[PDB]
Symmetry: D2
């Protein structure tokens, strides 16, 4: 009961004691919260395997651009595997090809309702003003994740993250564009500033390479996946291991298993406190409500925080304070339900039933929707405690948290 | 301009040392004074019009000290307090509840009568005999002292000390015997008759209550006092005697145990457990232990009361020289400020308001000081340390309360508005020492008085008619809070407040937290 | 290690993981065994002028004798000085227990001076409705909205018109105005010179009679301490200037004053007239914090035990004030009328010693040492590096003493600024330095009068041995104790670069 | 502060992640990590290379030394072959004994085959370190120690923690061993592969507390078995084992039987160097200060004193005179940023302190002086010349010098601050 979830190590008084109390016999029981991004290719274009992967852990499917009809088949195939169904949104990410001369894209971008763009070779804020200009007012609601992959981008990181919705640590290209021995510095720096900023961050490429042609990963690759979770990454990735390789689902299986283990061994006591000291005061009532709900979640070992949101914003500001409790986001928007897979700890649930006449009643119905999905999916049992986060009228106005026993 | 104020540059410092260095005397303490002030009522503060003045200066608890005065006397003080308090009842947004406390005389040990209003000098070195034989009860020598505590010969060993006359005369036990205790005079001095006796380090087996305290406490219950400060609390069994003296009608009376001697300090934890709160009674404590040690007992007791979430009072000689002078000494202002920095929920005035010449100015100086000192509290470290030391909880009131205080710090909330019927939610807010004012709306005149014991809690008494739809009755009370606070200065338009309420009526909870723009 | 180990000097509270827990484990039965380290300044007067009385005060703990030059003649002070030195030297026949005692000179300072009852309105400043002040630039420095206090801050007036003919004020607080009463100008940049003509004569008298320390009144800016240094002149180059911060501008320009002063006095007396009484504690805690961070000594002054002028025991606020001054960081605590004029001078010294001793043990060194080191800049000064290593070594082994050889006192001060619990036993041949290091908390100075030995390693050794025996004799040190010894590889300071761990034989 | 930039120049403080080192939180420390900040401090996480077909040449072993191998590992899972290996090592090491100021001790470890006679082979081949395999409880190591017997008393027992039982009875294992190896290869078989980092970070932690060497091993740079360049996951693994606290890191088939055995060592070296500069010492030192118990051991006291002083002046090195290596170890436990430069006469201690992160052992050949103090000053001056020649030390540097008042290592109790000339 308290033996699980690394709770003994979560209550240590120092980072050092915490490490010494990590218990291989303590079982992850929380839902796995770090999103897996799988890169689509041959081994993963079967509507068959997409069913097998989406059960294995996939949350985002990545469309690398290195033909349009090829990727449009990919799209419709993923989508069919998603709608065959516990229903689990799955977002679609377009990873632009970008400039190339060993160290177009507007067509790929204007090109089907993608949820995310991993823009490539980003180096300045203007770059992001491009991709956002090109996406035009019709492409606004899409999420720009600037890939950082060269020295110039590392050094201008603050101006890039400023305008971006998120960041990718493009380790493949960085390990050539800068000494390989310096990559870990770039990674940890960037993950830390993104957690500080509350904007999702992605660790990527070669994380489970050997699994391209083996069923079991190296020791280094186990450690590498854990440590990206420990660093604070929102999403971890798979490239060849799912594009062009013999173990697409054993891969997604083991990224799920590893991240489930690493997430429990996060030292929240220190992470939360160091966000209390580094984060500026906020006067946004939604952020204020979120830090309140996370603190309450911890005080009672909440099973989940159930938040209502339309744009995904409320669930993001919960995610930035890293609750152990799962963030059960209930939304009528269907792109929101896919785009929040960029924020660690958010499980989306899409409410399709229509509005109700009294504002109060519509909210409860969505909230009980979350409780029943949660009950059925293993998050909630009865006599559990949860935190509930809603508004008073219909995203900006999200300013209420309630403590509720599950009945 | 917001950052100039309430020492916010010092609040953001990364260490305590640097927090001290960034303290700024031009940073005005805009927020409202949260540490409650206890004024002992007497000749100098009994009259109604004075009391009105003192209330306005910032008195929050009136203290009736039954070491002196008749019951007819304190009845009239209680009477006049209530008249002063209710004179402001006509303006509900500004009405200031005021608690009443009874401070018991307590058991006592006294010497005999001499052969005489006469006097005699006990000489250092000289051999003095302390006897409980009634012969000498009127035949007090310079070498024989009679005492009205028979078991003094059972409870001071060889090597123990006997202190007479407010601690000025000291005596050491050399031999114990059937005629009495053989002493040598250690601190010589002049004793009169029926002087005060103190047995340092003894376990005094006197009753938790004297016969006068049962009469005084019965009087208390009959007059509806909110608070008993119980003298000479040495053990849990002493506080249970006090509760039984309060009888059936006194279950709701807060019992604040006075820790006044070595035994009570060492049994602190067991006393705090069955007490509602604690008074650090430095006056008798300073006679019972070495004076240079009282500051250790103060900070230990305040530290533990903060850990336990229970109100703690610092008492006696805080602005003592203001009994005759209109301005205090530099030690006195520093004492009040450090009591607050330490963590005290209340600070007290005894003679300064019961019998001196500047009672109103003495209330005003504690107000001004407490207000500066609250602002200089290093919340970054205190909030963290109270957070981590407190246990996990599945009580939704506790849970919401920590959430609410966390949210207040994030936005520098002007207030936290809380609906409570007992006070308990306000108290669970207060135990985390928010910087934001805890505005506590209640319908219970008792609760409104009693939560003055809790630092940070401004009680508002709501008299208006209940509304049929409960969600509407909640809103009107939150409004009452907002509008009371606007006009008292706690809240301005633009400010953010956290509001804490229950989900449904008589669910016994507060489990709703909202963030609201004014 | 033992049990009786942790049942004294508040060691259970020393090792708590938080400040809050530290507070909770403070124990009134945990005796302080360490020697009292916070020096006591006793203001000299009729109550404390006789040689016999001063011996009693030395034995009760007086470390610095303060000479208040607001009153009394040079000849009167020359007599105080002679009796102090007579009483101090009466103990020098025992080299292993002789306590140096510094002499400080507190300057009168600049002064603005003036039975009608100014009431509830309208006075002009240039009897009953007009006040004339001997400070012509009053009209120049008190703006419309500024204030003028008169007589101990009893009366206040508010400027409403700076006219050709002076300043038209309204009476804010009325009372009885007598003749030539002190005036204060809260918030003003008072352009009086750093020094008065009387001070210059007093400073000269001070150098001529060999005083160790100057408490310089009403210091507002760096230029003022330069004038005091100027008036002490080159024969007073070795005298310490402790700047009295007494008014709003002093507090606001504290940094620039600290940087050129040898230390600071928090002069709470005139500060509570010059700023709201309720704000002094803020100025006290900020000034002590900044002095502690800079490693420069800070004195806490005025009314600490005020009631003992007539009573044999202090009030509860008074012992509280003394303990909290120590807990704040103060290097020195001070007695004015309690030792100059009252009826219990010796007892007032005794009470300060007793409170300080208890409060020293209640310091939360775990947090204090962590914050002084994280906040102090890196250093390339071998004497500073060695000091911090030695203080760290002393905590690791709860050493009984740090024994340091110092000629100017500087090595001892650099140990003091990291606030060791271990006593800093400072062995010197300079009688003045040994008087002066009493400004530094935790420093017990030992004056060594034996002539040097021709070989340097042997001279170092005999002075270390003098410190261990004195320490044994006075109770600092028992056989088996560990001490940390701090010396140099050669003559000088900046060459104090050796730390040794020693078992007392 | 201006003396610091006058003395060292402004650029000094942009290097070795000093801007991130002064951060008030670990989060902000991470945000201040900088790929342009260069790791000027010598690389101090020792490298263990397993010897094999690709690493037995007398002339390859020279490439591995100049590349940074400090401990030669002998995997016993045939004698004629291993005594041949031991011989190639010693030939290779001694090719540089012509110039003592630059001679690099190298140690030799025997890693047991698993589940007695291999040890006494080791013993009287003069090996320095036993990597006991499959240890599960205290008696398994007491058994090992007994087998080594009297000729193997001076030999260091490094228990390999390979299964669930040894992970769970780890305290008592550690309580008796000289150190610990986190055997990831077998341990990823004997426990779920996703729980291994847990065992890892947990064991390193407890070893850091105990002041006892801990080694991270197996598959770190595996892809370099057949490739000249490592995986992104694999550079991260190396960096992260340093950040974890590991004293030592090891190469298996990167050097035994692979095509790039001198690039694998080279790469372990460059990663470790960057990662050491990246350690958050402020928090690490404090936590080890707060956990380490009060000591009346003069050598302990003097070591923490000297570590504190090294941080205060960012000293180029701490120079320690040690015979058993105890003093260098008690320095290593507090994880200085400054190089620990360990001058010893005992050739076996000079090889064995490679287990202690931060220690750079130098072997002193010259004969006693008559005067103890003269002998000390000549040993210290050797460490300084060795350091200047190798570029640890420049004129103007400050070093902390740790020595003894009289001969013997229960007598390390003097600490000196010194300017290199």
């Amino acid at each position: 009961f308290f033996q699980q979830q690394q709770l003994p190590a979560a209550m240590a008084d120092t980072f050092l004691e915490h490490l010494c109390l990590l218990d291989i016999d303590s079982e992850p029981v929380a839902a796995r919260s770090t999103s897996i991004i799988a890169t689509i290719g041959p081994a993963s274009r079967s509507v068959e395997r997409l069913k097998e992967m989406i059960k294995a852990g996939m949350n985002i499917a990545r469309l690398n651009f290195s033909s349009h009809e090829y990727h449009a088949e990919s799209i419709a195939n993923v989508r069919e595997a998603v709608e065959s169904f516990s229903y689990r949104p799955v977002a679609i990410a377009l990873d632009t090809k970008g400039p190339e001369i060993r160290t177009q894209d507007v067509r790929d971008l204007r090109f089907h309702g993608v949820d995310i763009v991993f823009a490539s070779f980003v180096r300045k804020a203007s770059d992001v003003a491009a991709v956002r200009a090109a996406l035009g007012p019709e492409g606004h609601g899409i999420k720009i994740i600037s890939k950082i992959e060269n020295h110039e981008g590392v050094k201008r990181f603050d101006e890039i993250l400023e305008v971006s919705d998120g960041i990718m640590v493009a380790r493949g290209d960085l390990g050539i564009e800068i000494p390989a021995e310096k990559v870990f510095l770039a990674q940890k720096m960037m993950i830390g500033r993104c957690n500080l900023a509350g904007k999702p961050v992605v660790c990527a490429t070669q994380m489970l390479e050997s699994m391209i042609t083996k069923p079991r990963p190296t020791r280094a690759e186990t450690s590498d996946v854990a440590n990206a979770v420990l660093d604070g990454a929102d999403c971890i990735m798979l490239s060849g291991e799912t594009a062009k390789g013999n173990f697409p689902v054993e891969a997604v299986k083991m990224q799920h298993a590893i991240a489930r283990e690493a997430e429990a061994a996060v030292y929240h006591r220190q992470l939360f406190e160091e966000l209390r000291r580094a984060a500026p005061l906020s006067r946004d009532p939604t952020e204020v409500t979120a830090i309140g709900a996370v603190e309450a979640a911890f005080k009672c070992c909440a099973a989940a925080i159930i938040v209502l949101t339309t744009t995904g914003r409320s669930a993001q500001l919960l995610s930035r304070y890293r609750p152990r409790a799962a963030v059960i986001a209930v939304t009528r928007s269907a792109q929101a339900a896919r785009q929040v897979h960029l924020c660690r700890g958010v499980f989306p649930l899409l409410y399709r039933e229509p509005p109700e006449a009294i504002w109060a009643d519509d909210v409860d119905r969505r909230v009980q929707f979350g409780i029943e999905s949660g009950k059925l999916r293993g998050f909630l049992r009865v006599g559990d405690l949860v935190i509930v986060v809603t508004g008073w009228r219909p995203e900006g106005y999200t300013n209420i948290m309630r403590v509720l026993s599950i009945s």
